[PDB]
């Protein structure tokens, strides 16, 4: 049983002290922090139902995929604000879309266990569902596109997996977590996704592989969100006690936290730069909130949402912003000047 | 400007349309979230209004009574551990709480799964319709007496059946007795706390039942009804 | 798919009459149904345009007035009626599918045609009428214009066709630099401003026929006769 677990995870937690040095933050402090970021809603996209659960960026920086709990899953031009595509959603509580990074597939998860893929450039004209992906036993809570040939979905019965859309089956299945998981990100190489759950513990596995590879903890409550840094070596977790903050992919530990005294309200939604340097956090506080990467400071807020901001995605250009809350309002916030 | 893009925006504009449309359906429409044990028979009172429109999880049962139309959502396949579809459901007009009476040994676990409704952060709002069904089944089981309601809850003695029950001709007094008491269990966990916020329905009901449709429409209505009182400042 | 259209044949001038498109399983309710005309041994032309859900029916200035076009969603049917023929429009006819999102293919599928025999704006020249049929090689056809159809958005809006000898001229190049799907990768297009080049990896029996343009950013949609392979 647990004769030998105690004692074998005593080198797992000193080796996260010992190994480590002063915080990134002191560090860092040395450069020098960018000054109050104000960012106007350029474009609103008033075109959805209710609360929009979550938007994924197309690869193009243009398009636009958002998803509200009527069906509605909608692909925007974002530069003339113009929506492409209008889908309607049989599973109709989808927490989850995503966009191809071919962008000939949308994917959307949701409460009803499948994931459904559909058709964009099919030889037809009309998006119809290519598959849907059965085998999950609890709630679908995050749908990113690995490639066209294989698509990464985690669910709430703590357990993600790897799916190939041509044949169906459950093709990977990843294990290990207490909790319901309700939030991953896929690197940019998508060669290793990283899972949080309720379990206040995130993990990273290996797309390829089926064991997890990496585990992290340190939140008080429920991992709400999770994204990848750009780079690829590190990823920030959103909780329920409004204390996101990021983990070294490498380093297996909490470099630092992201917190203030006026926060209360949890996260929802984390996105970032194209360099990082503008950690976007979807905060339930009715306003998403932009702080720094080096200092781990509040550097504006993105206010003009009348609810929960409940999703947010920053373009592949790294140009613009995207807001979904549940005014079903989506703002594409880009720099003032 | 473009002619490429001028047909793009009346494209877009075409399904503005379908999504004005798609507005006035979602707001005509209001959410009702089923909610219970499997000894329940919570699909089965699903099956007793209708042919539910299948899809596990979802079970999406719209239906319009009185030429009314609204669309109830049926659930139970999700993880049961917390519930965490809660949160995407506390918008939801009204929340079913279907439960059965026939065995008293889940009736406690019954108890502490309404208390953890009628408390619940995302239902601090949500009004709450009880549906006690198997009805017919205490009757039969209680009138075979071959278990005591004393053992399992020993306030059953004390009890006396109230006046203002109307029970129907052929229910014997016990069974009616029975019926009430495991009503005010319910009634009694529920009016302890919120009671302006929301307020819980009772009903007894069987695996056939017509009026479910109807009776489920009234207590909506009861909710709405409540809720433009609050908000147009009548109250 | 399949965009088969249907009508008559000869007619007298004063023979208003109706020529139908008709759609397979289509996506007809949500398509901009074109409408383009072809000479006989010459290049094509337009001849109208209604969009999905119509609200932009256009003409070409050449027919505009007497002839109309029509869509018909629940029996997925074009309608064309023609008043007062002259000599001039006995023509093959096409019956072209096109829907446009920010990244759409337009043009793609053109119904086999039907004939009619009866007894400013950007100008497409296409000079090159004549190209040698020899194989292995990378032979590429050049085009004019009147204005450079590079617009502030980042697009052209040039259009290449293929004719082979007899059926309905598949789409090569929609834009520039954008290959539609049932061709392959072996035809190519590029160029800049006004100046236009559709390139061919190598040569084989299917690559015959003559090659058709058209502009888009007003609505002249006039083509230019090309290469009779």
């Known amino acids: 049983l647990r004769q030998e677990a105690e004692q074998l995870k005593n080198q797992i937690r000193d080796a996260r002290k010992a190994c480590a040095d002063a915080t990134l933050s002191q560090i860092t402090n040395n450069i020098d922090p960018v000054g109050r970021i104000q960012m106007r809603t350029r474009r609103t996209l008033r075109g959805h139902l209710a609360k929009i659960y979550a938007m994924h960026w197309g690869t193009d920086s243009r398009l636009l995929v958002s998803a509200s709990q009527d069906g509605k899953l909608i692909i925007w031009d974002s530069y003339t604000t113009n929506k492409v595509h209008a889908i309607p959603l049989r599973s109709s509580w989808v927490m989850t879309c995503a966009y191809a990074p071919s962008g000939n597939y949308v994917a959307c998860g949701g409460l009803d266990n499948i994931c459904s893929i559909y058709n964009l450039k099919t030889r037809e004209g009309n998006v119809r569902v290519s598959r849907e992906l059965a085998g999950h036993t609890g709630y679908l809570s995050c749908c990113r596109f690995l490639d066209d040939n294989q698509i990464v979905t985690s669910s709430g019965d703590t357990t993600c997996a790897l799916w190939d859309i041509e044949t169906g089956q459950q093709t990977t299945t990843f294990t290990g977590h207490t909790g319901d998981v309700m939030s991953l990100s896929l690197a940019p190489d998508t060669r290793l996704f990283v899972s949080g759950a309720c379990d206040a513990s995130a993990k990273l596995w290996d797309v390829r592989e089926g064991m997890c590879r990496q585990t992290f903890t340190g939140h008080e409550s429920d991992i709400n969100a999770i994204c990848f840094f750009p780079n690829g070596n590190a990823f920030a977790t959103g909780s329920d006690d409004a204390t996101c903050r990021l983990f070294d992919l490498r380093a297996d530990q909490e470099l630092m936290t992201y917190s203030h005294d006026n926060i209360i309200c949890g996260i929802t939604s984390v996105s970032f730069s194209k360099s990082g340097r503008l950690l976007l956090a979807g905060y339930d506080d009715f306003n998403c909130n932009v702080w720094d990467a080096l200092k781990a400071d509040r550097a504006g807020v993105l206010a003009g949402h009348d609810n929960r901001v409940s999703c947010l995605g920053v373009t592949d250009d790294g140009m613009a912003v995207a807001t979904g809350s549940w005014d079903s309002f989506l703002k594409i916030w880009n720099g003032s000047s | 400007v473009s002619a490429e893009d001028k047909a793009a925006a009346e494209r877009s504009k075409m399904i503005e349309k379908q999504l004005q449309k798609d507005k006035q359906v979602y707001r005509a429409t209001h959410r009702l979230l089923l909610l219970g044990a499997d000894n329940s028979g919570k699909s089965t009172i699903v099956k007793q209004m209708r042919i539910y429109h299948g899809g596990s999880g979802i079970f999406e049962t719209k239906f319009q009574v009185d030429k009314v139309n609204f669309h109830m959502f049926d659930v139970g396949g999700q993880r049961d551990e917390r519930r965490k579809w809660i949160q995407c459901f506390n918008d939801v007009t009204a929340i079913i709480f279907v439960v059965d009476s026939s065995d008293y040994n889940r009736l406690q676990e019954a108890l502490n799964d309404f208390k953890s409704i009628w408390n619940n952060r995302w239902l601090r709002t949500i009004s709450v319709i009880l549906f006690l069904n198997k009805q017919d089944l205490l009757a039969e089981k209680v009138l075979a007496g071959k278990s005591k309601i004393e053992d399992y809850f020993p306030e059953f003695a004390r009890y006396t059946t109230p006046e203002d029950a109307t029970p129907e001709p052929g229910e014997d007094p016990r069974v009616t007795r029975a019926k009430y008491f495991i009503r005010d269990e319910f009634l009694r966990i529920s009016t302890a706390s919120g009671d302006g916020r929301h307020y819980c329905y009772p009903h007894f009901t069987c695996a056939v039942d017509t009026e479910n449709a109807r009776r489920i429409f009234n207590d909506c209505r009861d909710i709405i009804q409540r809720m433009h009182l609050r908000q147009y400042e009548l109250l | 798919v399949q965009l088969v259209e249907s009508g008559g044949g000869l007619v007298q001038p004063g023979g208003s009459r109706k020529l139908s498109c008709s759609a397979s399983?289509?996506?007809?309710?949500?398509?901009?149904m074109h409408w383009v005309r072809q000479a006989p041994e010459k290049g094509l032309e337009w001849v109208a345009y209604?969009?999905?859900?119509?609200?932009?029916?256009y003409y070409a200035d050449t027919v505009k007035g007497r002839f109309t076009i029509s869509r018909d969603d629940p029996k997925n049917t074009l309608f064309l009626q023609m008043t007062s023929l002259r000599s001039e429009d006995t023509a093959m006819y096409y019956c072209?599918?096109?829907?446009?999102?920010?990244?759409?293919?337009?043009?793609?599928?053109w119904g086999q045609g039907t004939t009619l025999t009866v007894s400013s704006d950007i100008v497409m020249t296409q000079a090159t009428s004549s190209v040698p049929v020899t194989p292995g090689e990378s032979v590429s056809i050049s085009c004019r214009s009147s204005?450079?159809?590079?617009?502030?958005?980042?697009?052209?809006?040039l259009y290449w066709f293929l004719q082979r000898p007899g059926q309905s001229p598949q789409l090569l190049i929609y834009?520039?630099?954008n290959l539609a799907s049932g061709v392959p990768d072996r035809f190519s297009g590029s160029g800049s401003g006004t100046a236009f080049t559709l390139t061919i990896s190598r040569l084989e029996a299917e690559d015959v026929g003559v090659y058709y343009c058209?502009?888009?950013?007003?609505?002249?949609?006039?083509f230019g006769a090309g290469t009779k392979l």
């Open positions: 072209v599918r096109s829907i446009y999102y920010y990244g759409s293919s337009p043009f793609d599928f």
């Open positions: 834009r520039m630099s």
């Open positions: 399983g289509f996506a007809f309710s949500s398509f901009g």
């Open positions: 058209m502009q888009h950013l007003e609505y002249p949609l006039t």
């Open positions: 209604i969009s999905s859900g119509s609200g932009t029916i």
């Open positions: 204005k450079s159809l590079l617009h502030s958005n980042g697009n052209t809006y």
